[PDB]
Amino acid sequence: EVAEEILRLLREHEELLREHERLLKEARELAERLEELARRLEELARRDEEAVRQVEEAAREAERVARELEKSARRLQESIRELRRLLKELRELLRELRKIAEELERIAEEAQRILEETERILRETVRIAQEAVRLLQEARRRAKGSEEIEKLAREIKRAVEELQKALEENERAIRLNKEAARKFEEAVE
């Protein structure tokens, strides 16, 4: 039964992986769209109903992408709970017992720490996505002086930088989850 429990956990990790890959895509597009709006805002400060219109349309679409980023990270968080619920059922099954079971408890205990670190990454990604939504909503209200448009453009560019740091940490958490799953395959073989 322990062998069948790992295989179900591996299937869940696979669905975890493709949802986390979708999270990277949404966050990569948001950062690109936020950098573009920042440049459009700095042009609006120096300059036009088209310049106001393109700021409104660039922010409105960047807000839709930030919502998808938030929805994807929320979906990943409710699935780490599934992984850990499957993990506790495995913890008791392997402790029913053999040296193979002793190896499975070191890689399962490590997988616990990775999932905890992974959800801490996702919670920070939700925060940056929520900060992006508020800044985008502020960009559309102000576009309806130059000094205030410049500061908002600078604040958006700082959100880009922490979004890029969240990209690195999410890509790192994917590797650690992939490597933890590879150990489950070889140890159960």
Side-chain angles (χ1 to χ4, degrees), residues 5 31 34 42 76 79-80 110-111 124 134 141 179-180:
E5 186 77 2
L34 289 177
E42 291 167 337
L76 276 170
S79 291
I80 299 182
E110 186 187 41
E124 192 70 20
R134 298 196 308 273
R141 296 194 302 269
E179 299 170 4

Side-chain angles (χ1 to χ4, degrees), residues 85-155:
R85 184 258 307 182
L86 271 61
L87 194 37
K88 295 184 180 182
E89 294 181 342
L90 166 59
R91 171 75 76 182
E92 313 302 316
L93 279 175
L94 65 91
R95 208 128 82 96
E96 292 179 343
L97 302 182
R98 208 176 308 188
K99 312 215 68 174
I100 299 182
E102 186 211 25
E103 184 66 26
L104 285 178
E105 75 182 337
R106 270 81 60 84
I107 52 187
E109 177 267 327
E110 186 187 41
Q112 290 185 339
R113 295 183 269 107
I114 299 178
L115 291 172
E116 296 171 12
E117 175 80 312
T118 301
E119 77 166 356
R120 190 193 57 79
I121 304 302
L122 298 177
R123 258 193 291 263
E124 192 70 20
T125 305
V126 172
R127 179 194 70 79
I128 304 170
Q130 289 175 352
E131 177 200 17
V133 167
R134 298 196 308 273
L135 289 172
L136 292 163
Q137 291 172 348
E138 179 181 341
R140 309 214 305 275
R141 296 194 302 269
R142 294 188 174 276
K144 290 197 183 70
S146 62
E147 298 95 330
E148 285 71 24
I149 300 303
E150 285 266 35
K151 176 171 60 62
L152 176 54
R154 291 197 294 272
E155 289 180 317

Side-chain angles (χ1 to χ4, degrees), residues 2-176:
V2 177
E4 185 176 331
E5 186 77 2
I6 269 82
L7 209 277
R8 170 170 163 172
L9 193 63
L10 294 176
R11 294 175 181 169
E12 197 76 0
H13 162 64
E14 186 57 66
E15 299 295 335
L16 261 285
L17 172 61
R18 44 219 315 161
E19 184 62 40
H20 209 163
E21 292 178 341
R22 187 175 117 81
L23 190 78
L24 298 178
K25 174 260 152 188
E26 309 296 328
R28 288 181 184 114
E29 175 172 349
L30 179 63
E32 299 163 357
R33 289 185 174 273
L34 289 177
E35 293 242 76
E36 169 70 11
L37 175 63
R39 301 190 299 267
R40 294 191 187 186
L41 279 174
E42 291 167 337
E43 279 293 332
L44 181 64
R46 290 184 291 260
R47 291 229 276 266
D48 192 1
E49 73 173 15
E50 174 72 20
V52 171
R53 186 186 302 110
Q54 67 180 21
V55 163
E56 194 81 359
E57 300 182 338
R60 172 172 41 81
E61 184 58 32
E63 181 173 351
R64 301 190 180 103
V65 174
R67 302 287 191 180
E68 279 292 320
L69 172 64
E70 183 188 52
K71 179 167 187 169
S72 178
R74 172 170 59 252
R75 178 166 191 169
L76 276 170
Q77 286 178 121
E78 73 186 7
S79 291
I80 299 182
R81 194 181 308 109
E82 303 293 321
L83 286 179
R84 286 213 278 259
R85 184 258 307 182
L86 271 61
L87 194 37
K88 295 184 180 182
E89 294 181 342
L90 166 59
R91 171 75 76 182
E92 313 302 316
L93 279 175
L94 65 91
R95 208 128 82 96
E96 292 179 343
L97 302 182
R98 208 176 308 188
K99 312 215 68 174
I100 299 182
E102 186 211 25
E103 184 66 26
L104 285 178
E105 75 182 337
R106 270 81 60 84
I107 52 187
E109 177 267 327
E110 186 187 41
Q112 290 185 339
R113 295 183 269 107
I114 299 178
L115 291 172
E116 296 171 12
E117 175 80 312
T118 301
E119 77 166 356
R120 190 193 57 79
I121 304 302
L122 298 177
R123 258 193 291 263
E124 192 70 20
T125 305
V126 172
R127 179 194 70 79
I128 304 170
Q130 289 175 352
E131 177 200 17
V133 167
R134 298 196 308 273
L135 289 172
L136 292 163
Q137 291 172 348
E138 179 181 341
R140 309 214 305 275
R141 296 194 302 269
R142 294 188 174 276
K144 290 197 183 70
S146 62
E147 298 95 330
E148 285 71 24
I149 300 303
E150 285 266 35
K151 176 171 60 62
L152 176 54
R154 291 197 294 272
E155 289 180 317
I156 292 181
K157 273 179 290 184
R158 306 207 171 92
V160 164
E161 298 184 330
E162 50 195 349
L163 196 54
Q164 292 172 335
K165 181 161 185 170
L167 258 300
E168 300 174 332
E169 295 178 341
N170 277 287
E171 294 161 345
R172 180 181 68 95
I174 289 184
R175 273 199 309 271
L176 299 174

